[PDB]
Amino acid sequence: MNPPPPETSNPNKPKRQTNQLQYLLRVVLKTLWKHQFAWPFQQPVDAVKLNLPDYYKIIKTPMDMGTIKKRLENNYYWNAQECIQDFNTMFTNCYIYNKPGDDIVLMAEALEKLFLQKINELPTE
Ligand SMILES: Nc1ccc2ncc(Br)n2c1
Ligand SMILES: Nc1ccc2ncc(Br)n2c1
Numbered sequence: 001m002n003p004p005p006p007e008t009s010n011p012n013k014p015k016r017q018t019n020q021l022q023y024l025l026r027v028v029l030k031t032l033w034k035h036q037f038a039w040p041f042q043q044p045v046d047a048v049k050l051n052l053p054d055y056y057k058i059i060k061t062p063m064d065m066g067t068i069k070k071r072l073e074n075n076y077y078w079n080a081q082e083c084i085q086d087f088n089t090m091f092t093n094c095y096i097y098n099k100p101g102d103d104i105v106l107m108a109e110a111l112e113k114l115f116l117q118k119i120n121e122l123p124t125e
Contacts, residue, residue, distance in 0.1 A: 003056055005044040006063060008070035019123045020080035025072040028118045029065060035114065037107035041065045041090060058097050063090040080122060087115055 032038055043066040047055040056062065063086050070076075077083045094108035 001053075001056075002044075002047050003062075006067045008067060008076060009074050010076065013076070014078060015075040016078045017075050018079060019125055021072060021075075021077055021083060023123050024080055024083050024119075025069070028115065029069055029072060031118065032111060032115060033065060033069070035111060037110050038065065040104060040107060041094075041111065055097060059093045061089055062093060063087075065090065080119075084119060091115075 033042065041064055044062060044064050045052065045055050045059075047053060065087075068083065068086050068090070071086070072083065091108050091112045094104060098105050
């Protein structure tokens, strides 16, 4: 069974736009999105579709790039570090749910390297 997907809006939570968050959407996310290994990560894991009935028994903080994209588009985040944390959660979830050497892990490893390359230098305020 699937839990509800992570929120992409929250009226109690303050919004912010920064040069770094704009870059995270326009450059980092939109470039990673086009990578040949991005497709498993473009939407929340559908455990019913994918026949992964234990996915959410293992992964308690799910995250994916579709959620991140909507959060960025909604100015959901306070700062770039909060968004970067969601990317890191997405990658770590992949390593937790699977095991070294799996195809999906090789995909996450490649995307993580590209992500780090792109966030190594961010714009300034
Ligand atoms: N679409 C996805 C996303 C993440 C993930 N971890 C293991 C499998 Br199979 N996964 C499939
Ligand atoms: N064994 C599986 C099942 C689903 C799936 N989506 C991406 C990868 Br890599 N996947 C591997």
